[model samples]
Each structure stands twice: as structure tokens, then as C-alpha cells.
Target: LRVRRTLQCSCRRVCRNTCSCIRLSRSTYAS
Candidate 1:
């Protein structure tokens, strides 16, 4: 495990303010 940025929440079929986004963190932080 390690330290990094994050996101959250679960609702409806979808939620949590979708940002089309640069997606840099996800590229790095993928499970």
C-alpha cells in the first residue's frame, strides 16, 4: 500500500461527478 490522491461514493447506476478528466492519477493508481 501507499499514499496518493483518491475518489469516492456509490449511488444510482452512476454518480460522483464525472470528469472526462486528464486521468493522470488513475493511470498511475489503478488497482
Candidate 2:
């Protein structure tokens, strides 16, 4: 259970970074 939780947490962090990167790219293109 602990390993599963850790994996989930790590995936969420990675997804958050990816989402932010996409948003930043879109904003930069808009400008």
C-alpha cells in the first residue's frame, strides 16, 4: 500500500509539471 501511494504521488507530480509546461507554452504562443 505504501509503495502504491508513493507511485501515485510521483505520477501526480509529473502530471502537474507536464500540465504547467503545456500552459506556459500556450501562453507564450499567444503573446
Tell me each candidate's TM-score. 0.15, 0.11
Q: What does candidate 2's lDDT look like per residue over 1-31, in tens digits?
A: 1222221222223434322222122332221
Across residues 1-31, which tens digit of lDDT does each residue of candidate 1 receive? 4333345322222254332233243443233
Query: Which sections of candidate 1 miss by over 4 Å?
Result: 1-14, 21-31
Give candidate 1's root-mean-square deviation (CA, Å): 8.6
lDDT of each: 0.32, 0.25
What TM-score quantifies how close candidate 2 is to the native fold?
A: 0.11
**Scored by Cα lDDT, where does model 1 land?**
0.32
True-vs-predicted CA distance for residue 7, candidate 2, Å: 18
